[PDB]
């Protein structure tokens, strides 16, 4: 019964069978193939730094209605091109082209978050100062 | 009160004095005042209320922390009405529980005597005896039922779609009821069969 061998000397078939079936687990397969090195923009790191190319607004998905604020960024270590979200409303005035920004993942392990189509990353720091400190008026940003 | 059933008359007359007689002879109970007098320490807890289309459905548990527990579900058109009627149904369903020792028999039972399981819908609940000072290792809803029964230490495991609340309570209620079904070697002895009280006091009960 139960469709699997029970015999006392059947250990070889049991372990070989498990190896074949682990390839259906989604995160197991990612490790063993090394997908994060060969592809995806951060080559497996938690953060990356880039140069701002241009400023964009993204229309939210229906049923919500908003024009959300984003930037195009080129990553320094790869040259790959990416779009990032800028949190906290008026903070978009703190970023301008050829600024240098630090980016982080948008919390969903490579999926897009909420209303925003195709945006996977958010800005953390610009020109070496954190956006949270600027928004709360705790520090000042030098131009260049 | 004015009892209407034969058993109610004997209870009000004081011929029957403990609920253990009723369980021993497996008699039916129809009048909630019977429980209300034999078992006065009973207290109640309200587990859930939700509106439905408007009506209200209420889930109620009653017990005393000393070996008796009951469960009841009622739908009514008023919140106070659902709770009121819910308590009546729960009192009628009261059943006894068998509890024992995890190891050596020092100083009063504190856990279950055996492993037991119950099932309702997809949900299954399993109860395992535990050593002293473990407490009740269960989710909050099931934990409350086991407290009112008076269990101190027990492990639990479960399977199925436990997020459907009333299937989970019914399954747990079945599991603790099964504790008296399991024959064990200290129950192998032979007993004479008692005479029913409805025989002895037949003329007190009539008319």
């Amino acid at each position: 019964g139960k469709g699997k061998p029970r015999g006392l000397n059947s250990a070889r078939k049991l372990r070989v069978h498990r190896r074949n079936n682990r390839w259906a687990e989604n995160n197991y397969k990612k490790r063993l193939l090394g997908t994060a090195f060969k592809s995806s923009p951060f080559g497996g790191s938690s953060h990356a730094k880039g140069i701002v190319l241009e400023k964009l607004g993204i229309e939210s998905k229906q049923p919500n209605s908003a024009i959300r604020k984003c930037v195009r960024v080129q990553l320094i270590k790869n040259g790959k091109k990416v779009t990032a979200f800028v949190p906290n409303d008026g903070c978009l005035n703190f970023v301008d082209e050829n600024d240098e920004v630090l980016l982080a993942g948008f919390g969903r392990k490579g999926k897009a978050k909420g209303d925003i189509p195709g945006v996977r990353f958010k800005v953390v720091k610009v020109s070496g100062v954190s956006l949270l400190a600027l928004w709360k008026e705790k520090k000042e940003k030098p131009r260049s | 009160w004015v009892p209407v059933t034969k058993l109610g008359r004997l209870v009000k007359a004081g011929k029957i004095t403990t609920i253990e007689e009723i369980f021993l002879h497996s008699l039916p109970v129809k009048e909630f005042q019977i429980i209300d007098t034999l078992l006065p320490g009973l207290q109640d807890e309200v587990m859930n209320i939700k509106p439905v289309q408007t009506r209200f459905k209420a889930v109620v548990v009653v017990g005393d922390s000393n070996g008796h527990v009951g469960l009841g579900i009622k739908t009514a058109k008023e919140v106070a009405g659902a709770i009121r009627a819910g308590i009546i149904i729960a009192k009628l369903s009261v059943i006894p529980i068998r509890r024992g020792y995890w190891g050596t028999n020092l100083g009063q039972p504190h856990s279950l005597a055996t492993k037991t399981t119950g099932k309702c819908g997809s949900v299954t609940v399993r109860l395992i005896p535990a050593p002293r000072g473990s407490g009740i290792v269960a989710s909050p809803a099931v934990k409350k039922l086991l407290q009112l029964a008076g269990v101190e230490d027990v492990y639990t495991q479960s399977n199925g779609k436990t997020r459907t609340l009333e299937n989970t309570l019914k399954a747990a209620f079945v599991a603790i009821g099964n504790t008296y079904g399991f024959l064990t070697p200290n129950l192998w002895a032979e007993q004479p069969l008692p005479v029913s009280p409805l025989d002895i006091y037949s003329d007190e009960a009539s008319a």
């Binding site: - | 020092l106 050593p131 000072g133």
Partner: protein
């Protein structure tokens, strides 16, 4: 390089963060015994967890197994010495029934209140931290010090403080001087 220094963490966090019934029971303990943190409660439940684990293991061994006799008796001996376990309950099955309040009862902060000396658990804590209490000859300034049964006879004010027999403190001295200066007009 030199050998590594060993160290370990001494507390554990509850696994459900916002359980209303737990939150109330903890605040009653903090108010009764004058604690400052939930961490001070997590420390005690962490200790008790290890004690139960050890005892629960030994109880699976056969009676008269030599290890159960040797390590079991040591564990009991040790809990009686601090007064957490009553000398009547001197059996491994009663160790499993201990609870958090039995340990809190033995802290120096609460003993200094039961003896007199202080008029609240909040007054007691300040006296200890301000170096007024001695245990035997030694000044002790840690509130969580566990008082062994032999030590209770020897709790008293320290010799080098007011209340204990020394000179008045800095503020008392200042006032007497200023008054004398005005009176010594």
């Amino acid at each position: 390089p030199r050998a590594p220094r060993t160290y370990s963490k001494t507390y554990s966090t509850p696994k459900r963060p916002y359980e209303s019934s737990r939150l109330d029971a903890e605040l009653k303990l903090a108010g009764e015994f004058g604690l400052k943190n939930k961490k001070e409660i997590y420390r005690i439940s962490f200790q008790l967890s290890k004690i139960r684990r050890a005892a629960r293991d030994l109880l699976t061994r056969d009676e008269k197994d030599p290890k159960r006799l040797f390590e079991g008796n040591a564990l009991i001996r040790r809990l009686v010495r601090v007064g957490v376990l009553s000398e009547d309950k001197k059996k491994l099955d009663y160790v499993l029934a201990l609870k958090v309040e039995d340990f809190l009862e033995r802290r120096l902060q609460t003993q200094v209140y039961k003896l007199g000396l202080a008029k609240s658990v909040h007054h007691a804590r300040v006296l200890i931290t301000q170096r007024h209490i001695a245990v035997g000859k030694q000044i002790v300034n840690i509130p969580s010090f566990m008082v062994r049964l032999d030590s209770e006879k020897h709790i008293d004010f320290a010799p080098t403080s007011p209340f204990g027999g020394a000179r008045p403190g800095r503020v008392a001295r200042r006032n007497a001087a200023r008054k004398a200066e005005a009176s010594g007009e």
